[PDB]
Amino acid sequence: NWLGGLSRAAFPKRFVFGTVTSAYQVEGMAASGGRGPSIWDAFAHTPGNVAGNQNGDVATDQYHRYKEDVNLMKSLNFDAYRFSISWSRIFPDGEGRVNQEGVAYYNNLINYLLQKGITPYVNLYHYDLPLALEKKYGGWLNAKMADLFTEYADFCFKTFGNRVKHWFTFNEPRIVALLGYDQGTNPPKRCTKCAAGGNSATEPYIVAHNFLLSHAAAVARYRTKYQAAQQGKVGIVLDFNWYEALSNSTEDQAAAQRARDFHIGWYLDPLINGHYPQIMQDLVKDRLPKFTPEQARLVKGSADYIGINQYTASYMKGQQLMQQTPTSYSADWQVTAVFAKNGKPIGPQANSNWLYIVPWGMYGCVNYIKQKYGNPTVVITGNGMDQPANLSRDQYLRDTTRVHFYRSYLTQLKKAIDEGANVAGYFAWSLLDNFEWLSGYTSKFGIVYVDFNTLERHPKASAYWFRDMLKH
Ligand SMILES: OC[C@H]1O[C@@H](O[C@H]2[C@H](O)[C@@H](O)[C@H](O[C@H]3[C@H](O)[C@@H](O)[C@H](O[C@H]4[C@H](O)[C@@H](O)[C@H](O)O[C@@H]4CO)O[C@@H]3CO)O[C@@H]2CO)[C@H](O)[C@@H](O)[C@@H]1O
Ligand SMILES: OC[C@H]1O[C@@H](O[C@H]2[C@H](O)[C@@H](O)[C@H](O[C@H]3[C@H](O)[C@@H](O)[C@H](O[C@H]4[C@H](O)[C@@H](O)[C@H](O)O[C@@H]4CO)O[C@@H]3CO)O[C@@H]2CO)[C@H](O)[C@@H](O)[C@@H]1O
């Protein structure tokens, strides 16, 4: 069957199904309703940065259309909606004055979701640092971010936490560290060779450390001030793509494990075990900041659940570990990614060049977290694939590849859960075609088509797939 035996009955009782967006990617009204600019507003408005010089000024205009979009998700039988609050929509300068119109938007959205029986899962941060904080403090390079983020988090807990019971602090700090500070292709565009300055061998580690410390401080505030009354939870969202040893050699198996440690262990070992992975300590040495015992104790156990964004997989080929002059976080891994084995590609690519369709990667990631980290509560916080630009409306709607993608990936997730993985929920990226960062509007991840000329929504085949699969 086109559902392939999948239904709510195929997953644990009370298992949560949702869709996901992020503020800058869908809201629009980027310079309206009192919102202050983020580092992404500045970046996207700079010619050459984004495909077609596009930006999120309007995006999908969810700001005005949110009731349409909530009605749609309810009609598709989803239980939950993961979205983010724009920090600069609440605090236009990142600190100080509150934008009451901004607060009103999120109240209206949260209240309508609950009215419609959709549980809000709320991210505090999704790449969108207030520009004022980047300029004044140097953003995530500054340890003061822990205080600044905590004050922002505190406001959100106070203001929305009587209704919001499922929080995330950050979205993919690895990608911020990697693209913002190693490669320098995302804001603030820092790297060794970059015009804005930087150092690809040191800054990604500083940035990751400050995300972990800020996460821990915000959760400490939640637990000490808000938890007793509000009785909600706070997690974090981490990207994890699977790495499989290219061969059964000791070298290749070590390479795959090294890649896992530099990718997900970078954050999970501090969050679960209170230290960075040993291999990163051994290889990165004095470039890897050290948690004090007090900080390690604040960070350890500070996530109530682990959000995982899972998309793809690759093979890893090893080498003899070498003494090398440090150049970048990326080069520190001492591995080679490989996308074919025995002459056959690991899988076909979606529109995004990095996204190989490899459903067994979902099983790989979830099983690995279960076995390595004491089976923590995991939520799949984003999974999906993209169509290219320039298709007709009807071609977008007949998204048979995406239907196959979800059926296969969810079957692999089911396999891991049936083997005992502690997965509490699953969220499809995305509800809507949206502003896909550097790809702008040239990458279409939605189960719902958005006509970017008219802003009309049209559910794709994959939307009706979810509706059928999720019927109560
Ligand atoms: O309906 C509005 C809109 O829907 C869009 O999506 C369509 C798909 O294009 C179409 O293929 C899909 O057909 C499903 C059907 O809904 C299921 O009920 C049926 O399930 C069968 C299954 O085939 C058997 O193997 C199994 O044993 O039994 C079940 C249940 O009896 O499977 C077919 C697919 O083969 O329906 C979607 C939703 O309508 C359309 O693209 C668009 O044109 C429509 O406007
Ligand atoms: O994109 C959809 C949606 O989900 C989330 O998107 C994240 C993904 O979770 C994350 O895996 C993805 O990471 C990519 C990254 O964007 C690429 O820049 C990077 O490219 C590699 C390249 O493949 C290599 O050949 C080269 O050597 O190195 C570069 C990196 O230096 O590959 C990784 C995947 O391995 O990034 C997405 C965001 O850009 C987000 O939460 C959401 O907002 C997205 O819309």
Ligand SMILES: [Zn+2]
């Ligand atoms: Zn509008």
